[PDB]
Design a binder for this molecule. Structure first.
Ligand SMILES: Nc1ncnc2c1ncn2[C@@H]1O[C@H](CO)[C@@H](O)[C@H]1OP(=O)(O)O
Ligand SMILES: [Cl-]
Ligand SMILES: [Cl-]
Length: 205
């Protein structure tokens, strides 16, 4: 049997990946300047977040669908054998970014998947949240933080937002509204969604 990739996911083009990478850099630089962030620094001299989130990927940003660990992961073989997965393999997709976010552990961009893009999303064996809510693009990680965290951090954020714990926006950036969720969490609800071009394929390390 042919073993699977490390993980499936949409991989952004050079232009898209550069666009979002700079968009995230500006966000972290602006958030680090904002007065509302400095007050709640103890909950989280100046702390520049670009350094703080030092761990970032090889350089091509991606939105992971299914982590297969070459087949070691559960539901890996089940996932890859799907027709939509093999049909969509190598095909280009347009992902939408609704927001950027930051926690003490991770920083990333929230992806909003279209229904067709939802057919490529796994549903293996996160309560009351529509599938695909986890969809994200990691922008950086803290030193002792695993890659897996970034997805979990987004879910936990959206768990609060549906409750209305974000409340008032503590600031207004030129590209969106800024939100304090406490416990070091920060969300930038983008005014206009960022669209990016990405190819759905498998990554083998
Ligand atoms: N249980 C898991 N263990 C390790 N990596 C996982 C994982 N689930 C998803 N991943 C992804 O494995 C890759 C390792 O770089 C990451 O992209 C991570 O997605 P993420 O970066 O979007 O959070
Ligand atoms: Cl995932
Ligand atoms: Cl999910």
């Amino acid at each position: 049997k042919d073993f699977l990739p490390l993980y499936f996911g949409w991989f952004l083009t050079k232009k898209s990946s550069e666009t979002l990478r700079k968009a995230g850099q500006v966000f972290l630089e602006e958030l680090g300047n904002h007065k509302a962030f400095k007050k709640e620094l103890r909950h989280f001299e100046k702390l520049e977040l670009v350094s703080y989130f030092g761990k970032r990927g090889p350089g091509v940003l991606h939105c992971t669908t299914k982590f297969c660990d070459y087949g070691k992961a559960a539901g890996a073989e089940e996932y890859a054998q799907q027709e939509v997965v093999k049909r969509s393999y190598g095909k280009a997709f347009k992902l939408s970014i609704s927001a950027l976010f930051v926690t003490p552990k991770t920083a990333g961009a929230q992806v909003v998947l279209t229904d067709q893009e939802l057919q490529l999303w796994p549903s293996d064996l996160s309560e009351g949240l529509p599938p695909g809510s986890r969809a994200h693009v990691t922008l950086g990680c803290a030193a002792d933080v695993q890659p897996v965290q970034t997805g979990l951090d987004l879910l936990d954020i959206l768990q609060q937002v549906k409750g209305g714990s974000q409340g008032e926006a503590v600031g207004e950036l030129p590209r969106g509204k800024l939100y304090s969720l406490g416990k070091g969490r920060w969300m930038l609800s983008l005014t206009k969604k960022m669209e990016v071009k990405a190819i759905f394929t498998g990554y083998y390390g």
